[PDB]
Amino acid sequence: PGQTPIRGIFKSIAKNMDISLEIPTATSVRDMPARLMFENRAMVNDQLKRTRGGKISFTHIIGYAMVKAVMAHPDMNNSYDVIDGKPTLIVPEHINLGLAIDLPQKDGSRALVVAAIKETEKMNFSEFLAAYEDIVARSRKGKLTMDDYQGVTVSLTNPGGIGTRHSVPRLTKGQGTIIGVGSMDYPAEFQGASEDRLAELGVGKLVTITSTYDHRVIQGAVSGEFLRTMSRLLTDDSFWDEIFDAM
Amino acid sequence: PGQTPIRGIFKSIAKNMDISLEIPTATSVRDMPARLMFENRAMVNDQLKRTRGGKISFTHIIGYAMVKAVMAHPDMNNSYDVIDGKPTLIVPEHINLGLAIDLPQKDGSRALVVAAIKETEKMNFSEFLAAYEDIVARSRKGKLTMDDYQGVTVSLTNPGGIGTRHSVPRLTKGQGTIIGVGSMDYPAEFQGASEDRLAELGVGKLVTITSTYDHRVIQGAVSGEFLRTMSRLLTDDSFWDEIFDAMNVPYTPMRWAQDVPNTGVDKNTRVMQLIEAYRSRGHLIADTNPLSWVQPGMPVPDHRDLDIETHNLTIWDLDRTFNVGGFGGKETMTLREVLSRLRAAYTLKVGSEYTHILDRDERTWLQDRLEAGMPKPTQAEQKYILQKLNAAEAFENFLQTKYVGQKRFSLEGAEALIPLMD
Incomplete structure (x- = not known):
């Protein structure tokens, strides 16, 4: 006190x-x-088990989809600054994707930091997965440099791990957008129903995705089209052929 | 203009x-x-009605859950300030909970004010309910002081009263979080469906809760864990035992479970087995003791036969309809009505044992008279019972006063014997 x-x-x-x-x-x-994600993820993890590989997660898949969407709609990668006292638009060279890593410290208090996967627009799924696991691995061993915390252009956060449905987060200076991923679960009006009855009806599971953007440089129509593209990719024939080919 | x-x-x-x-x-x-809230709230309000008490609301229950959650996650009670030009974290002594009271004024314009319930972290549900009703009561009579508007640490708002689904509200200086409670209603894609069809599927009702927090002192993970704890409490066995204990209700609370399929033994068979269990063993949980006393060294019999879980039934069956074979003079009934009748006949102030009798006509005579109930007495009859009780107690007190040391073997404690024999 x-x-x-x-x-x-x-x-x-x-x-x-x-x-x-x-x-x-x-x-x-x-x-x-979110039904096709569950199915196709299971098929990929069965292949890895026989070849004594690892395991892919939902964040990996949504991460890769997000990169493809930013390529389709490049305005989502821009930012704003005042330089020599004039308003200015900033168009970066690369798509550097920031991951929100929640890491406990020596004291025993949790702190959130954002590390970057760099030059993501020239990667396939195999390359992407490797880079992701590299950042995560070095974080646990305590071997991240100062260069890894610089140059982020767009960020990803996952409040759905705990079970939050969606959030409205803050945007930090130097970026144009932040994307949030919510819970992958049945709606709460179905959480007491039987499996038999849900199977008869044909009820699936959801995922809710948000976009928070700087309105001086990105307009609403662009943000909407971005989310529409992400929705199409996660249920698309050509998208899942790429992932299967690479694994 | x-x-x-x-x-x-x-x-x-x-x-x-x-x-x-x-x-x-x-x-x-x-x-x-939100299904278990509806069920268990109804059970508490039935107890209060017989004891000529009041009525609890959904805000009372969610309020108490919110307090328990803040105790589990104390960071949600902190705030920020700049003191001597340095950034500072402020950790208060108590949890003071602010209620948004919408009160019209003398002029005729509505205004919103926040009054505080103080020192909430050292209260049980009974104490909490009293404090809540105190603030509300004095607001209507116009007797709130200036001290009641000071020292709030965390606030609660209820936009779901009108029917809003959720909101994103503003946070005022001096606090760290504000919690909002939305509508308790079916989603809008189900607002034209039939009751029959919704009951078949197993569709329940929602409540949406929000958390708005200051990001200089509270992080996202803490806010998420706070809401996860609130979700667990409102569907938890131990939480509803506390509330029932404090309000003096004699039944076990309804429990949370998934809906089960109508396979194997049919559900009509299970409802008939429940009727037989209450007729046979319902005296084991009846309200027949004037004291709240259990003798320490005596064995307590098993009475698991009287809860709906042992017969493979669930809260999701309470509004479905079943064949009951003449029970209550009806061929068909809901599980809610069945439980109500059984509890009124076998679990109140009279407990009966008669199923061991071998003759069928005897059993039927008793069963019919115990399920009809006690008829309502006239006013003359009621006054006659009061005269006899008075005579009994008065006689004892007279002898006590006039002959102190003398041995008499008193009837004090058991004066109802005189109207029984009469």
Whole structure:
């Protein structure tokens, strides 16, 4: 009980959130079928088991879909800055994707950091999976450099791990959009029904995806079209042929 | 039409909303099943009706759950301030819960104010309900002081009263989070379906809860875990045992489970087995003891036969209809009505044992008279019972007063013997 100064990484988190108050933001929300993800993921993991490989996750698949969507709609990768006292649009060279890694510290307090997968627009699924697992692996062993925390152009967060349905997050300075992935579960009006009855009707599972963007450089129509493309890819013949070919 | 200056309480509301522009905020949204709330609330209100008490609401239950959740995740009670020009985290002593009371004024314009229930982390449900009703009562009579509007640490709002599904509200300076409660209703794709069809499928009702927090001192993971805990409590065995214990209700609470298929032994067979169990063994849970006393060294008999789980039935069967074979003078009935009748006949102030009798005509005579119930007595009859009770107690007290040491073997404690013999 009482007052105590903020020190350390926590002070840095506080200062950045204060700076972020000068970004005008809007949000879009869309819900998508998730049945084909479950099925096709199971098929890939059966192949890996016989070849004594690993295991792919839902974040891997949604991550790759997000990259393909940004390529289809490049405006989602731009940002805003005032340079020499004039308004300016900034168009980067690469798509660098930031992952929200929740890592406990030596003290015993959780802190969130964003590490980057770099040069993602010249990768196939095999290459993408390797880069992802590289960042995660080095984080646990404590071998991340200062270069890994620089140059992020677009971010991904996953509040659906705990079981949140969707969120409205904050955007940090230097980026144009942040994407959020919600719970993959039956709606709550069906959480007491029998399996037999759900199977008869033909009820599937959901995933809800959000987009929070800077309104000085991205308009609503672009954000909507971005989410429509992601919805199409996760149920598309050509998308799953690429992944199967590569694995 | 035109321009007019803002004056009064409205000017204060305007100024505070302008100050609130300097808080960085984020929001989380989660949807939760609400069937067990409906069921267990009905059971509590039935107890209060017989004891000429009041009525509990959904805000009371969600309020109490919210307090328990903040205790489990204390970071949700903290706030931010700059003191001597340095950033600072503030950790309060108590959990003071603010209620959004919409009260019309003398003028005829509605205004919203936040009053506080104080020191909530050292309360049980009985105490909590009293404090809640205290604040509400004094608000209507216009007897709130200035101390009641100070020291709020966390707030609760209810936009679902009108029927809004969810909201994204503003956070005021001095707090860390605000919680919002949305509509408790079927989704809009089911608002034209039949009751019969919804009952067959097993569709329940929702409640959507939101959390808006200051991101300088609370992170997203904490907010998510907070909502996960609230979801677990509202469907938890131990949570509903506390509430039932505190309100003095004698039954076991309804439990949470999945709907089961009508396979193997049919469900009509199971409802007939439940009727037989209450007729045979219902006296084991009847309200026949004036004291709340269990003798420490005596064995307690098993009475698992009297809960619907042992007969493979669930909350999802309560509004379905079954063949009951003349029970209650009806050929067909719902499981809700069956349970109601059984409990009224075999679990109140009279407990009966008669199923061991071998003759069929004897059994039927007793069964018919115990299920019809006790007829309502006239006023003359009622006054006659009061005269006899008075005589009994008065006689004992007279002898006590006039002959103190003398041995008499009193009937105090058992004065109902006189009207029974009469």
